[PDB]
Amino acid sequence: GFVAKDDSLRTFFDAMALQLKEPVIVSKMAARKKITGNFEFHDPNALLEKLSLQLGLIWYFDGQAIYIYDASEMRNAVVSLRNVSLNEFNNFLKRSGLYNKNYPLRGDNRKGTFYVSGPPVYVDMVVNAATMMDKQNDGI
Incomplete structure (x- = not known):
């Protein structure tokens, strides 16, 4: 107290x-x-x-x-996600327990990017995760 x-x-x-x-x-x-x-x-x-x-x-x-x-330090990011579904990527963040509901991924299944806005340490993680995942799926 x-x-x-x-x-x-x-x-x-x-x-x-x-x-x-x-x-x-x-x-x-x-x-x-x-x-x-x-x-x-x-x-x-x-x-x-x-x-x-x-x-x-x-x-x-x-x-x-x-x-x-x-709030002024919020990072606003646009992130490429070409080779994985937004839904698959979301679930991946969730299962891993890194996802924070207050700073959700904002996208749609038609386009190859999504937005995310939140704490820098969080957004940096989201960007890295998307970059790693997109590469590893970049193939037939």
């Missing part, structure tokens, strides 16, 4: 992380925001979702660490 009084987001999320196994990595732009209020950390993921909406943040848990960015 924690009563914040104009504390930097970095200090705040460090406080949240005390009761977590994973470190929290707060971007430069997120860290310059301040936060005030009475906080209880009885449900960190729910809090993260709410604060991301209140304060204009985006976040990703990659299974080992939590990344927090300002």
Whole structure:
């Protein structure tokens, strides 16, 4: 528990992380925001979702660490996907547990690209995954 009084987001999320196994990595732009209020950390993921909406943040848990960015650091990507169905690629991300429902792949089965917008660490993964998968399927 924690009563914040104009504390930097970095200090705040460090406080949240005390009761977590994973470190929290707060971007430069997120860290310059301040936060005030009475906080209880009885449900960190729910809090993260709410604060991301209140304060204009985006976040990703990659299974080992939590990344927090300002909404202004959102990466907007267009990604080629020529040799695999969008649905196959989606399921692949999901099964692997890297997919984040807050940052969905936006495409259609007619065209050879899809869009994705979200935390840089996430989008970088999505782009790499699509690039690896497209190549490995580039054949009869």
